[PDB]
PDB file of all heavy atoms in Angstrom:
ATOM      1  N   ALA J 145     -24.304  14.635  16.687  1.00  2.00           N
ATOM      2  CA  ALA J 145     -23.084  14.567  17.456  1.00  2.00           C
ATOM      3  C   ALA J 145     -23.150  15.356  18.762  1.00  2.00           C
ATOM      4  O   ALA J 145     -22.580  14.939  19.784  1.00  2.00           O
ATOM      5  CB  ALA J 145     -21.913  15.115  16.693  1.00  2.00           C
ATOM      6  N   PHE J 146     -23.819  16.512  18.736  1.00  2.24           N
ATOM      7  CA  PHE J 146     -23.900  17.289  19.965  1.00  2.24           C
ATOM      8  C   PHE J 146     -24.571  16.465  21.026  1.00  2.24           C
ATOM      9  O   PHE J 146     -24.239  16.573  22.205  1.00  2.24           O
ATOM     10  CB  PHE J 146     -24.907  18.438  19.817  1.00  2.24           C
ATOM     11  CG  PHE J 146     -24.350  19.502  18.887  1.00  2.24           C
ATOM     12  CD1 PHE J 146     -25.198  20.462  18.319  1.00  2.24           C
ATOM     13  CD2 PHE J 146     -22.982  19.545  18.609  1.00  2.24           C
ATOM     14  CE1 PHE J 146     -24.674  21.430  17.460  1.00  2.24           C
ATOM     15  CE2 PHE J 146     -22.448  20.503  17.744  1.00  2.24           C
ATOM     16  CZ  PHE J 146     -23.304  21.442  17.162  1.00  2.24           C
ATOM     17  N   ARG J 147     -25.544  15.647  20.611  1.00  6.19           N
ATOM     18  CA  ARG J 147     -26.317  14.827  21.601  1.00  6.19           C
ATOM     19  C   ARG J 147     -25.551  13.623  22.112  1.00  6.19           C
ATOM     20  O   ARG J 147     -25.614  13.247  23.280  1.00  6.19           O
ATOM     21  CB  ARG J 147     -27.664  14.339  21.038  1.00  6.19           C
ATOM     22  CG  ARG J 147     -28.759  15.400  21.169  1.00  6.19           C
ATOM     23  CD  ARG J 147     -30.108  15.032  20.552  1.00  6.19           C
ATOM     24  NE  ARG J 147     -31.018  16.181  20.718  1.00  6.19           N
ATOM     25  CZ  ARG J 147     -31.431  17.037  19.765  1.00  6.19           C
ATOM     26  NH1 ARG J 147     -31.106  16.870  18.491  1.00  6.19           N
ATOM     27  NH2 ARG J 147     -32.204  18.089  20.079  1.00  6.19           N
ATOM     28  N   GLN J 148     -24.811  13.008  21.209  1.00  5.85           N
ATOM     29  CA  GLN J 148     -24.017  11.873  21.637  1.00  5.85           C
ATOM     30  C   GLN J 148     -22.781  12.182  22.492  1.00  5.85           C
ATOM     31  O   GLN J 148     -22.439  11.398  23.358  1.00  5.85           O
ATOM     32  CB  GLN J 148     -23.511  11.102  20.409  1.00  5.85           C
ATOM     33  CG  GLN J 148     -22.881   9.748  20.833  1.00  5.85           C
ATOM     34  CD  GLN J 148     -22.385   8.889  19.661  1.00  5.85           C
ATOM     35  OE1 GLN J 148     -22.344   9.357  18.528  1.00  5.85           O
ATOM     36  NE2 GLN J 148     -21.974   7.641  19.872  1.00  5.85           N
ATOM     37  N   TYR J 149     -22.051  13.278  22.225  1.00  6.71           N
ATOM     38  CA  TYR J 149     -20.831  13.616  22.931  1.00  6.71           C
ATOM     39  C   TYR J 149     -21.015  14.641  24.017  1.00  6.71           C
ATOM     40  O   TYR J 149     -21.311  15.773  23.682  1.00  6.71           O
ATOM     41  CB  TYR J 149     -19.844  14.285  21.959  1.00  6.71           C
ATOM     42  CG  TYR J 149     -19.244  13.270  21.029  1.00  6.71           C
ATOM     43  CD1 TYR J 149     -19.996  12.557  20.100  1.00  6.71           C
ATOM     44  CD2 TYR J 149     -17.873  13.063  21.090  1.00  6.71           C
ATOM     45  CE1 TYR J 149     -19.426  11.593  19.270  1.00  6.71           C
ATOM     46  CE2 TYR J 149     -17.283  12.126  20.262  1.00  6.71           C
ATOM     47  CZ  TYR J 149     -18.051  11.398  19.366  1.00  6.71           C
ATOM     48  OH  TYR J 149     -17.407  10.469  18.636  1.00  6.71           O
ATOM     49  N   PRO J 150     -20.779  14.283  25.289  1.00  5.71           N
ATOM     50  CA  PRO J 150     -20.953  15.274  26.353  1.00  5.71           C
ATOM     51  C   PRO J 150     -20.242  16.598  26.110  1.00  5.71           C
ATOM     52  O   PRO J 150     -20.824  17.667  26.281  1.00  5.71           O
ATOM     53  CB  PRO J 150     -20.429  14.617  27.657  1.00  5.71           C
ATOM     54  CG  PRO J 150     -20.614  13.104  27.391  1.00  5.71           C
ATOM     55  CD  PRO J 150     -20.423  12.939  25.852  1.00  5.71           C
ATOM     56  N   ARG J 151     -18.961  16.558  25.748  1.00  8.40           N
ATOM     57  CA  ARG J 151     -18.162  17.758  25.543  1.00  8.40           C
ATOM     58  C   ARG J 151     -18.504  18.550  24.283  1.00  8.40           C
ATOM     59  O   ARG J 151     -17.928  19.633  24.052  1.00  8.40           O
ATOM     60  CB  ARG J 151     -16.658  17.546  25.695  1.00  8.40           C
ATOM     61  CG  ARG J 151     -16.405  17.473  27.231  1.00  8.40           C
ATOM     62  CD  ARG J 151     -14.998  16.951  27.499  1.00  8.40           C
ATOM     63  NE  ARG J 151     -13.989  17.687  26.694  1.00  8.40           N
ATOM     64  CZ  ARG J 151     -12.943  17.218  26.002  1.00  8.40           C
ATOM     65  NH1 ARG J 151     -12.629  15.919  25.936  1.00  8.40           N
ATOM     66  NH2 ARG J 151     -12.170  18.105  25.338  1.00  8.40           N
ATOM     67  N   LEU J 152     -19.370  17.982  23.442  1.00  9.38           N
ATOM     68  CA  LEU J 152     -19.837  18.729  22.253  1.00  9.38           C
ATOM     69  C   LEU J 152     -21.053  19.458  22.791  1.00  9.38           C
ATOM     70  O   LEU J 152     -22.064  18.855  23.036  1.00  9.38           O
ATOM     71  CB  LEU J 152     -20.241  17.882  21.050  1.00  9.38           C
ATOM     72  CG  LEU J 152     -19.040  17.267  20.333  1.00  9.38           C
ATOM     73  CD1 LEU J 152     -19.552  16.467  19.138  1.00  9.38           C
ATOM     74  CD2 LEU J 152     -17.924  18.269  19.968  1.00  9.38           C
ATOM     75  N   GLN J 153     -20.921  20.731  23.096  1.00  6.18           N
ATOM     76  CA  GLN J 153     -22.014  21.400  23.734  1.00  6.18           C
ATOM     77  C   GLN J 153     -22.803  22.353  22.899  1.00  6.18           C
ATOM     78  O   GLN J 153     -23.500  23.229  23.482  1.00  6.18           O
ATOM     79  CB  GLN J 153     -21.638  22.006  25.107  1.00  6.18           C
ATOM     80  CG  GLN J 153     -21.243  20.929  26.134  1.00  6.18           C
ATOM     81  CD  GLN J 153     -20.942  21.502  27.541  1.00  6.18           C
ATOM     82  OE1 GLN J 153     -19.778  21.746  27.851  1.00  6.18           O
ATOM     83  NE2 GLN J 153     -21.925  21.676  28.445  1.00  6.18           N
TER      84      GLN J 153
HETATM   85 NA1   NA M   3     -23.249  17.224  24.067  1.00  9.84          NA
END
Side-chain angles (χ1 to χ4, degrees):
Chain J
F146 289 163
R147 277 176 182 107
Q148 190 178 9
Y149 286 64
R151 283 167 49 224
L152 287 181
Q153 296 183 264

